[PDB]
Scaffold this active site. Sequence first.
Site, short mmCIF file in Angstrom:
data_model
loop_
_atom_site.label_atom_id
_atom_site.label_comp_id
_atom_site.label_asym_id
_atom_site.label_seq_id
_atom_site.Cartn_x
_atom_site.Cartn_y
_atom_site.Cartn_z
CB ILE A 1 -0.97 0.04 1.18
CG1 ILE A 1 -0.22 0.06 2.54
CG2 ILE A 1 -2.00 -1.10 1.09
CD1 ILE A 1 -1.21 0.20 3.75
N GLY A 2 2.12 1.08 -0.17
CA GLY A 2 2.96 2.23 -0.20
C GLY A 2 4.40 1.89 0.04
N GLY B 1 10.68 1.77 4.49
CA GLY B 1 10.53 0.46 3.90
C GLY B 1 9.15 0.31 3.31
CD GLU C 1 -6.45 3.11 13.89
OE1 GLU C 1 -5.66 3.69 14.66
OE2 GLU C 1 -7.64 3.42 13.74
CG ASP D 1 8.66 13.47 6.74
OD1 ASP D 1 8.62 14.52 6.06
OD2 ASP D 1 8.87 12.34 6.20
N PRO E 1 0.82 14.81 3.23
CG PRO E 1 -0.24 16.17 1.61
CD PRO E 1 1.11 15.96 2.32
CG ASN F 1 2.82 11.32 7.20
OD1 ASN F 1 2.16 12.34 7.35
ND2 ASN F 1 4.14 11.31 7.20
CG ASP G 1 4.71 6.64 9.52
OD1 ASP G 1 4.07 5.62 9.87
OD2 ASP G 1 5.23 6.72 8.40
#
EC number: 2.7.11.22
Length: 290
Positions: free
Chosen positions: A10-11, A16, A73, A119, A122, A124, A137
């Site tokens: 998903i990203g 990582g 989550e 950091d 959008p 995160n 994060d």
Amino acid sequence: MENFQKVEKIGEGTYGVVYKARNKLTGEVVALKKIVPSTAIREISLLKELNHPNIVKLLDVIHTENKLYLVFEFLHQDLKKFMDASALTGIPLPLIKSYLFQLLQGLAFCHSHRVLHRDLKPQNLLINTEGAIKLADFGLARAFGVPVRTYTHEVVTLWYRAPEILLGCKYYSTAVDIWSLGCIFAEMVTRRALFPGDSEIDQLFRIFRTLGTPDEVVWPGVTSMPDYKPSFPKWARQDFSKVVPPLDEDGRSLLSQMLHYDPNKRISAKAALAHPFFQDVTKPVPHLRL
Ligand SMILES: Fc1ccccc1-c1cc(NCc2ccncc2)n2nccc2n1
């Protein structure tokens, strides 16, 4: 890791790959982030207690064979995708307002524990079908650092970076998250990144072109910072009515306070929650197509 089944990537995160995964046991659907010095383990371990409805929950940490995974989550969409989808008509002001209000609550909670994000962007900021938005994060920057390039060599964006970081302040504060969130607020309103710099100097000069080149009057001590150069060009500050039309005066007032140069004077998350812009806040439900 044998306890989780990866569903899909998903990203590509700062540290990582990020996967949507399922707990082979409970059946729980989670986000799994691949990222170890003891100091990093201790810092991350403390994040397990930094719980709030607007902060993506850190469920667990797995460290085996010297490979580290964080289990979070899961949320279905990020703010970047939602802004891209809402670009024809823009995100309605009541929803921008609800999202900003919720994000400020997440910041206020973390900042009360002296934990920074450092950091925000959008990618995160995550949303669900209920109208909630959450910060992902939080606290990882202190644990792992913020690299110049990600694990895939992708450039870590500068667009939301506070000026005190760019000017070489070593001990920047919770104010750096308020600056980032102000940039994101402006971007939701105008449908365009506020300061899309493509190098540190371009980032800094973009900020200066809009907000004026900082000086000792607006930011006492700025000319002493490590990366400040007396040869920076002197640009004049633009009126916010030009910068973020058609935001109303309450929004412009709050934004201006979130983008103050002097970090000690930049508005706190707690004080921003009390700003008149939030007098009529509500919680609309976004239209999500998943
Ligand atoms: F925070 C992040 C930064 C970079 C990459 C991913 C993330 C990222 C993305 C998501 N979910 C949103 C999503 C769901 C499905 N497809 C795409 C995105 N999630 N969910 C919990 C953590 C997380 N981190």
